[PDB]
């Protein structure tokens, strides 16, 4: 009793790939066949299922509309056509015979790696903000840090304020330039790889999420934000 | 197997007198794990003394236990009419509990 | 703090009987429980004992292979199953809580008479 | 049926005081009598109990060895002798008749206020540190703020580092002077009412609790600390 | 330059204790010596000060009239005599040399723990009321919950109503018995560990704080209160 | 049912201390009483035992000959006399009632901290060696690190080699000076807080444990050793 | 250039022993001489020091007050008098010449083993808990293991819970008996050498360290604890 | 049932040393007691044996004429007098109860290290 | 003088595997008076098997001894981590007791 997988490989986002699984040693044409995948360093996730003629094929919500399970009982082969692939589809894909109360997934294919990527990565300057959270009171000082993995040329670093449900608002650009209409209690400083945003005396309207942003190259990146609550 | 021998088998006494009861074991009673019980006709046994000399809660001071090793004594300083009953000694120092054969105070 | 006994009565030789002891007022599930009997006109005699899970149950030589002590902690009840009864088993049977160094048999059931006769 | 209370007032720490409670309208000598207290803004707390001739009397753990409950049945009077008074004893004290299964505390005294205090204030310099907690990685910068309610004369402000189970360790004094043996990555600054401690590049041994301390008058005060974790 | 401490330990409320601090490596006779304490989990707090012959000795407000600082310059030893001890005095106590503008507390002792306690628990029946606050309008229904950590034997649980500046007033006892004169809109229910007080139709005079109270053992305890506002 | 403990504190090595534990709520005269201690950040450790006066008192090898357990049944009090104290006795000591098959240690005192120390608020110079283990082959290079918690004055740091069952052998002193008879393949370097021992080409006779050692003050300390396998 | 050590051996707790170290090849009368010890499987630890007349003798806190270092310069002999011995003194003791900047410990005695023990060739019952740590969330199952090196007669094994700063609390005794007031979600099982503590559904109040404890003989021992986080 | 050993330590060649072994928990007066030693990194090696009064004490050839085994039944103590010590005598020495057909060396002392060096 | 020869000198095995240890005597061992001991680093030897095949009280069943005359075997059915130690055989059939040189199971 065996399941021989083939296919997979490295593909670009939006591309297509077909997986196949050739069965032997059991009455394949009667067996329910599933596909299961496992993202790198993650757990098992059911993908799709197919059974006898007269039954519904089933899909996971992530793939419904993009993947197609099929079978050719004349070749004892199971297929998975994967369209509109994105980096979240990167996983090892297993074919498996489903025996339900008679063995669950009792036979597994060996699994094939499907990696969907456009060439990353990468050279991107990584921005790390600290701390993730600051609990303060009105009138107190807020000091926020942004550290870059590489030097930010021309100190092209900006700071944004974002309140819930609203678009980000420019506070500081060119590391130290306070934008027009921004109160003087906001000030930015630093150079190279070490930048700081200081709110001298917090007001009740200053409690929000703050992002740093480097625009010194063709691959703009943001920090993950510091929440001031 | 520890044999307990009580004496005397019978004590005929009047109210106000003292009753001295003896329990002698064939072997030493470890930790002085020896108890005394009072039983009246038709009733369940009642704990009087445990650990050779400890008086159970509610037991009047006129009852007192003493001794160690193989020689134990229960003393009733001043017999009351309600004290006339059968009294048993009991060793619980091993896995085979044994009782004396009782002393009837009448 | 009490032990409620039930059962007993008059039975024929070779018969069977089950005694019950329902406890209240203390943590029965953790207590060592004993059965003690007293033949008419005779003295007290230990019969059997049962304790926590992981301890050995014990029987007097005179009842080994005929009597079975057991407990249902969910119901706070002690049992004695008495099989192969003989005229020598005639006695008042007491359940009792065993406190060891902290009070020996400090709590007794009221006792029930078991008479074996034909 | 009433309890008439008397006594109380304002005393100094280490002082003594006796409360009274005169009963009427019931057989006082058969009733259990309790004292209950209520600190300003907090809830009710049992203090002591007393009962019949064979007086088995009880005390709350905090007052044992300091308070004594007693009664004079010929006068129908309940007493509470209070010794070794401290600020935690500040409360409104009630006498109450305990009815148990027939009414719990069915009769209460009107209550008397007992205040233990050695002075009105309390007019000290208050240091407020920010933030209370900083979650940072090694290599990052920790910026700690210490704000004073009044100007710190001569900038007599010090910083201390304290690790779990150890005594505090002087880092900075005179607002900006490093103590001997303190690495250069620690630096203090500020004047008047606004002071900051900055740890430029956090080492694993730098994660601890940091306190600021003003010594510009005869009432030394500390901040409540900032935990760098 | 070192301060070697000794003394401390565990004592009962109202007890007395004396701490010692032996100095070496500096001219102790001319030094200003302080005591500083730190309750478990709390911050540093100044206690007392002593200096040259011809200066004043100072004490924190809470310890005035209870603690006495002293020194024996012939033996280079500092002392703290602690009387009228209560639970609020539980802390690690430090002796420290005060250097003023030349180092603040630049030298510390290792500290000794003083614990003031008459017992170790703790095993009282804890009552937990919910919710802490109820904002309701007249005519609505208030449902108050009281949960016990252990079963309340005989359902000996009472409810009290307290208005600002007034003594508590018995509403319910024995979990469900309405006290004489209590309107029928109040009603208690529950058993074991779960008890509720229900005010069916709130009147303006019903807005107050409500406490539950178990009296099933020798250690009476209250809930912390529910404020119906 | 309670054990009220008292005593403890900070004492000099070789000093004496007496602990007390006052019982209530049970027949103390019949109960076996034990002492249990817990070193800082360690587990529970049995200390001593006492029972009826027809049995023998028991002690752990750690304390036998210096400590004395005793009891006064007329005061329901347990005692522990602690003589000839050593820094190894530093722990929180608990009194406990032993119920054997009827509850093990079912009642505990709250515990009191005993610290046996002669030092001040400063810490000894701590040496941390890394890595803990090095697995290498003959001919390869071994690089060992010793980092000090404080700067080592005059670079008074030494390196020793110890083979199983033998006394340590001096390799390097004054950080870089190679001892007499030591092959040139051993060499030390570094200053202040960062020191290194280098074995240029390992021989089979070089596989041993290596310790660093600072002698820049009156309190000598050693590293915890690096094993070269 | 030699140090010939002698003495040591196996001694009872509380006993006495004297170590000797005979020097040759150098001007002993002027040399600083130290004692250093090494517990089995541990690192080097300084013990004591003696020097010229006019200098102080020094001791480690572990031995100060019980050990006496001395010298007889007319016989070029160093002594260590060891009184009031305890199990924690078990170690190999080395005499060593201290040369400071001229060689640190450049000459060592060969070392002699001192073992302080009252036991026989049998070992106490060793309890091993696993795992050392469990990271769980409220509502989940905690399964803790305690394995004994020998069979625990009568299954006299107990489980305790200890929260930070508090005394241990009895959970289970006699392997399976749940103590009074312990919630039913705690349950113990096992016999002989294999025991388990199970917390069916963790609550937030259950996060603590858990110890097993055997009381089946005269030498009580504890497990080293499992921390549930 | 245990053997409490004492003695040992570091001595110079030609020196002397006496080892002790205190027994409890069995009738020492009737037991055969042996000494066994183990040089560092090597195996177990029998040294000497002693039994009831009237029986022969035995010695390994390597210690015959230098070591003397003895017992004091009144003190339940076994002794080994070690004279004319040399570097080869460096070993951990164990006292042990010999049970023969009922358990060989079933009880051991914890052992004490004897090192002979100059 | 009976010489005991153990083999192999060293056994490298993983947990769960079986260890088979051999002790061969230069002469017949009278009454099969042969014992096996386990010794861990720094500890006294511990009796495992005596009389060639008797497993001492408290020794787990996974240890078993067999053989007679001059050929003896100690078998550890399923190695546990605590079983890795040195094992000695020992003959006590005459007045000159002798030991094997040990087998280290690592």
**Chain C neighbors (3+ CB pairs < 8 Å):** B, F, G
Same structural domain, D63 and D14: yes
Please name the method used to determine this structure: X-ray
Which of A121, A144, A173 is the C-terminal boundary of a domain?
A121
Contact I46, I39 (CB under 8 A): yes
Helix/strand/coil for G153: helix
Q: Do F106 and G45 touch (CB under 8 A)?
A: no
Contact F215, F186 (CB under 8 A): no
Break-preceding residues in chain D (C–N over 2.5 Å): none
Which of E121, E143, E165 is the C-terminal boundary of a domain?
E121
Outline where A48-155 has alpha helix (H): none
Q: Do F150 and D181 touch (CB under 8 A)?
A: yes
Specify which residues F199 forms β-bridges with: F142, F186
The CATH number that applies at residue I77 is 2.60.40.10
Q: Which residues of F touch C51 (CB under 8 A)?
A: 101
Pairing of strands F133-134, F226-228: parallel
Distance from CA of C98 to the nearest CA of B (A): 9
CA atoms within 13 A on the CB side of I11: 25
Contact F171, F182 (CB under 8 A): yes
CB atoms within 10 A of CB E47: 23
Q: Which of H46, H104, H109 sits opposite I50 (nearest CB)?
A: H104
In B26-105, where do the E strands start and end? 34-39, 46-50, 54-55, 63-68, 71-76, 86-91, 98-99, 103-105
Closest chain G residue to I82 measured between Cα atoms? G149
Same structural domain, A90 and A161: no
Which of E84, E99, E121 is the C-terminal boundary of a domain?
E121
Specify which residues D146 forms β-bridges with: D129, D195
Contact H111, G121 (CB under 8 A): yes
Same structural domain, A182 and A229: yes
Residues belonging to chain F with any Cβ–Cβ distance to chain E shorter than 8 Å: 2-12, 108-113, 115, 117-122
Q: How many domains does chain E have?
A: 2
Q: Which residues of D touch F121 (CB under 8 A)?
A: 167
The CATH number that applies at residue D161 is 2.60.40.10
Contact D134, D226 (CB under 8 A): yes
Contact E16, E64 (CB under 8 A): no
Nearest to F20 by CA among G174, C5, E10: E10
Contact D44, D147 (CB under 8 A): no
**Resolution of the experimentally solved model in angstroms:** 2.0
Buried b / exposed e over F10-23, threshold 16 CB at 10 Å, is bbbbbbebebbbbb
Q: Is B touching F (3+ C-beta pairs, cut-off 8 A)? A: yes
Contact C17, C112 (CB under 8 A): no
Query: Domain span at residue B46?
Result: 1-106
CB of C51 within 8 Å of a chain B CB? The answer is no
Q: Give the mutation candidate from F33, F51, F102, F106 for the C interface (greatest C CB count, under 10 A).
A: F102
Cα H109 to Cα A142, H26, H39, H42, H77, distances in angstroms: 69, 14, 16, 18, 12
Q: Which residues of E touch F120 (CB under 8 A)?
A: 2-4, 107-110
Cα B47 to Cα A126, B38, B44, B89, distances in angstroms: 81, 7, 10, 10
Q: How many domains does chain I have?
A: 1
Q: Which residues of B touch F52 (CB under 8 A)?
A: 31-32
Q: How many domains does chain H have?
A: 1
Residues belonging to chain F with any Cβ–Cβ distance to chain C shorter than 8 Å: 27, 30, 101-102
Same structural domain, D4 and D115: yes
Query: Domain span at residue C76?
Result: 1-118
Same structural domain, A100 and A130: no
Contact C50, C57 (CB under 8 A): yes
Same structural domain, G93 and G173: no
Q: Which of D128, D130, D135 sits opposite A131 (nearest CB)?
A: D135
Q: Do F118 and E4 touch (CB under 8 A)?
A: yes
Interatomic CA distance for residues I36 and I17, integer angstroms: 20
Structure tokens at E91: 């802390």
CA atoms within 13 A on the CB side of I80: 7
Interatomic CA distance for residues E228 and F12, integer angstroms: 57
Query: Domain span at residue G228?
Result: 122-229
Same structural domain, A22 and A65: yes
Closest chain G residue to C32 measured between Cα atoms? G177
Give the count of Cβ contacts less than 8 A between chain A and D.
Answer: 36
CB atoms within 10 A of CB G178: 22
Q: How many helices (H) and strands (E) does chain H have?
A: 0, 11
Interatomic CA distance for residues G140 and G144, integer angstroms: 13
Contact E191, E175 (CB under 8 A): yes
Locus of tokens 């030349």: E102
**Chain D neighbors (3+ CB pairs < 8 Å):** A, E, F
Contact E209, E227 (CB under 8 A): yes
Same structural domain, F83 and F136: no
Give the count of Cβ contacts less than 8 A between chain B and F.
Answer: 9
Q: Which of E40, E120, E150 sits opposite G181 (nearest CB)?
A: E150
Interatomic CA distance for residues H37 and H93, integer angstroms: 4
Plot region of F28 (φ>0 → left; ψ -120 to 50 → alpha; else → beta) = alpha
Instruction: Please tell me whether the peptide bond between G131 and the residue prior to it is cis, using omega within 30 degrees of 0.
Output: yes
Percent helix, strand and coil across chain G, each to the nearest 5? 5, 50, 45
Interatomic CA distance for residues E180 and E201, integer angstroms: 19
The CATH number that applies at residue H16 is 2.60.40.10
Same structural domain, E56 and E86: yes
- Dihedrals φ, ψ of A87, to 5°? -55, -20
Distance from CA of E85 to the nearest CA of D (A): 7
Burial environment of residue G189 by CB neighbours within 10 A (0 to 12, 13 to 18, 19 or more): middle
Helix/strand/coil for F185: coil
Same structural domain, G72 and G89: yes
Structure tokens at C57: 């149950």
H or E element: which one contains D186? strand D186-191
Cα E89 to Cα D39, E86, E114, F109, I58, distances in angstroms: 18, 6, 8, 20, 54
Structure tokens at F15: 């000093």
Contact C94, C78 (CB under 8 A): no
Q: Using CB atoms and an 8 Å cut-off, which of residues 53-82 of chain H contact chain I?
A: 56, 58
Burial environment of residue F203 by CB neighbours within 10 A (0 to 12, 13 to 18, 19 or more): exposed
Same structural domain, E11 and E115: yes
Q: Which residues of F touch G166 (CB under 8 A)?
A: 110
CB atoms within 10 A of CB A14: 11
Q: What is the DSSP string of F76-130?
A: TEEEEEE-S--GGG-EEEEEEEE-GGGTSEEEE---EEEEE----SS-PPPEEEE
Same structural domain, E66 and E92: yes
Closest chain H residue to G16 measured between Cα atoms? H7
Q: Do F94 and G66 touch (CB under 8 A)?
A: no
SS (H, E, C) E80-96: EEECCCCHHHCEEEEEE
């Amino acid at each position: 009793v065996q399941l021989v997988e083939s296919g997979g490989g490295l593909v670009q986002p939006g591309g297509s790939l077909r997986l196949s699984c050739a069965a032997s040693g059991f009455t394949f044409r009667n067996s329910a066949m599933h596909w299961v995948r496992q993202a790198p360093g993650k757990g098992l996730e059911w993908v799709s299922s197919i059974w006898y003629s007269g039954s519904n094929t089933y899909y996971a919500d992530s793939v419904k509309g993009r993947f197609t399970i099929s079978r050719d009982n004349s070749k004892n082969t199971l297929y998975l056509q994967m369209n509109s692939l994105t980096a979240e589809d990167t996983a090892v894909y297993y074919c498996a015979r489903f025996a339900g109360g008679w063995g669950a997934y009792d036979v597994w294919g060996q699994g094939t790696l499907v990696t969907v990527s456009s060439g990353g990565g990468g050279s991107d300057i990584v921005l790390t903000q600290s701390p993730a959270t600051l609990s303060l009171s009105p009138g107190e000082r807020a000091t926020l840090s942004c550290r870059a993995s590489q030097s930010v040329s021309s100190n092209y670093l900006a700071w944004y304020q974002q309140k819930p449900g609203q678009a980000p608002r420019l506070l500081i650009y060119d590391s130290s330039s306070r934008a027009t209409g921004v109160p003087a209690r906001f000030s930015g400083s630093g150079s190279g790889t070490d930048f700081t945003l200081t709110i001298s005396s917090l007001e009740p309207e200053d409690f929000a999420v703050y992002y740093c942003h480097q625009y010194s190259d063709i691959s703009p990146t943001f920090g993950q934000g510091t929440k001031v609550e | 197997d520890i044999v307990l021998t009580q004496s005397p088998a019978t004590l005929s006494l009047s109210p106000g007198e003292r009753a001295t009861l003896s329990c002698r074991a064939s072997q030493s009673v470890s930790s002085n794990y020896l108890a005394w019980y009072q039983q009246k006709p038709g009733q369940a046994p009642r704990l009087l003394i445990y650990d050779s000399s400890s008086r159970a809660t509610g037991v009047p001071a006129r009852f007192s236990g003493s001794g160690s090793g193989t020689d134990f004594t229960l003393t009733i300083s001043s017999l009351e009419p309600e004290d006339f009953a059968v009294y048993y000694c009991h060793q619980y120092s091993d896995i085979s509990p044994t009782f004396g054969q009782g002393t009837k105070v009448e | 703090v009490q032990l409620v006994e039930s059962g007993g009565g008059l039975v024929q030789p070779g018969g069977s009987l089950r005694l019950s002891c329902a406890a209240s007022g203390f943590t029965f599930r953790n207590s060592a429980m004993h059965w003690v009997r007293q033949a008419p006109g005779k003295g007290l005699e230990w019969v059997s004992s049962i304790w926590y899970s992981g301890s050995n149950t014990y029987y007097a030589d005179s009842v080994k292979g005929r009597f079975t002590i057991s407990r249902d902690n969910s119901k706070n009840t002690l049992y004695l199953q008495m099989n192969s009864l003989t005229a020598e088993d005639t006695a008042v049977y007491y359940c009792a809580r065993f406190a060891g160094g902290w009070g020996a048999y400090d709590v007794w059931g009221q006792g029930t008479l078991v008479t074996v006769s034909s």
